Write a protein that binds this ligand. Structure first.
Ligand SMILES: Nc1nc2c(ncn2[C@@H]2O[C@H](COP(=O)(O)OP(=O)(O)O)[C@@H](O)[C@H]2O)c(=O)[nH]1
Ligand SMILES: Nc1nc2c(ncn2[C@@H]2O[C@H](COP(=O)(O)OP(=O)(O)O)[C@@H](O)[C@H]2O)c(=O)[nH]1
Lengths: 242, 239
């Protein structure tokens, strides 16, 4: 199992969608989603609670995730069979917050922390510490929770998103070179679709080429471009289980 | 007094430079007590250098750097200027969550305790600083401000990096006090970027770009007279 841990809007769901090749997640996560990816000739999806029913429409998978959510600790089990995926089990976890919004409980931070802790305390669970690049890495809730249960970094891979959203005159070179805050497995830089790209109905195919172009064109990341991007992250997660 | 609270790199020190009207801070370890005094003559005074009047703000930066070397004892600085209002600012170190290099393992809680020393004081106005390119529900500043001021009686929300927001996004619901309502509402600011600091861009030029940003933004246009740092200075003055 691979748990996606980070603050709210870190880019966790976008990472999962890139691994599928189809848009199927709602845009926020209230329950943990156990997403099993299975390499198959036939492309379809099925829910644990929705036995027998196969889904060929990924918009209907999203509506079913939305229907089942309507925070809670009981997980939603989803299996996607696809020729484009690897054999990996990922857990979409709700994002860590600090202040409750609307009719949310006041201890929501400590409930989401408790929920994540049930998954990441297990020795065979690999932690994907997702942190946006346009935030200070020392302030990462993802790294703090990962160091708590895994101090040595034996099962921690740092994920740096929103690298295209960094302020002019800055880069995350020292972070991505594993220098500012070293991890045993290091960091993998990713560039997901912006809010505009999603509303503009941009493909996951067009996202990956723009992502590869970004790392090859950036002067601060060009020298490490083959250690970057979502395909390399999928490769590293596969290389451990295989 | 006014305590500037946030996570690291939130844009706290930038507020102090916009209030002063001159770039003067090195690029927080120790707290900074910046007392602003409206004066005809423009100069800066340090308590430890009792007597010396500083006229070169690049020499004020060199002294802040030299005196700093985390600790709770603050560097006390007075800035006499015709463009400032009679206010005291507490530039508190930004809270982090993971120790970097030789920093103590309990650094986060060490910073929190030091911030708590100031924000537990009843006649201390809390300036909750949150960048716009981060989710407001994740605000370290707002959590800490709500821990000592649950009613929001002495909390003013400050939103930085509105120019760094993703394409197809805005903080209108935040600045309209709808997402996370605060009694005293929110003030949006546009500070010097990292290129602007490196390129030594003037504060006057940065305050002019901040003004044109709110006047131009189709999502902040209607509230432009409630936005910007000169308005934030005016709000902290009235109180
Ligand atoms: N520009 C840019 N936007 C991103 C990136 N990753 C996520 N986003 C945007 O940030 C918001 C949050 O992304 P999401 O994956 O839903 O975050 P989650 O709550 O952690 O699952 C969405 O509006 C995304 O379009 C990125 O790498 N670059
Ligand atoms: N583009 C942009 N950059 C900002 C803004 N506010 C702060 N920054 C940058 O963010 C970094 C941290 O700013 P700083 O004032 O030192 O934050 P502090 O550590 O909280 O005191 C600096 O490189 C600033 O240039 C803003 O509104 N817009």
């Amino acid at each position: 199992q691979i748990a996606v841990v980070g603050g709210q809007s870190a880019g966790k769901s976008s990472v999962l969608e890139n691994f599928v090749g189809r848009d199927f997640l709602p845009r926020v996560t209230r329950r943990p989603l156990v997403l099993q990816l299975i390499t198959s000739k036939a492309e379809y999806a099925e829910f644990l609670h929705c036995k027998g029913k196969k889904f060929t429409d990924f918009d209907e998978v999203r509506l079913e995730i939305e229907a089942e959510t309507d925070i809670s600790s009981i997980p939603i089990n989803l299996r996607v069979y696809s020729p484009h995926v690897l054999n990996l089990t990922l857990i979409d976890l709700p994002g860590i917050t600090k202040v409750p919004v609307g009719d949310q409980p006041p201890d929501i931070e400590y409930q989401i922390r408790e929920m994540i802790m049930q998954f990441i305390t297990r020795e065979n669970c690999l932690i994907l510490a997702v942190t946006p690049a346009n935030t200070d890495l020392a302030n990462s809730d993802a790294l703090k929770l990962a160091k708590e249960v895994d101090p040595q970094g034996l099962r921690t891979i740092g994920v740096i998103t929103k690298l295209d959203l960094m302020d002019e005159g800055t880069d995350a070179r020292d972070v991505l070179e594993n220098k500012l805050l070293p991890l045993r497995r290091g960091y993998v830089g990713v560039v997901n679709r912006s809010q505009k790209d999603i509303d503009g109905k941009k493909d996951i195919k067009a996202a990956m080429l723009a992502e590869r172009k970004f790392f090859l064109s950036h002067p601060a990341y060009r020298h490490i471009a083959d250690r970057m991007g979502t395909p390399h992250l999928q490769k590293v997660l596969n290389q451990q289980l295989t």
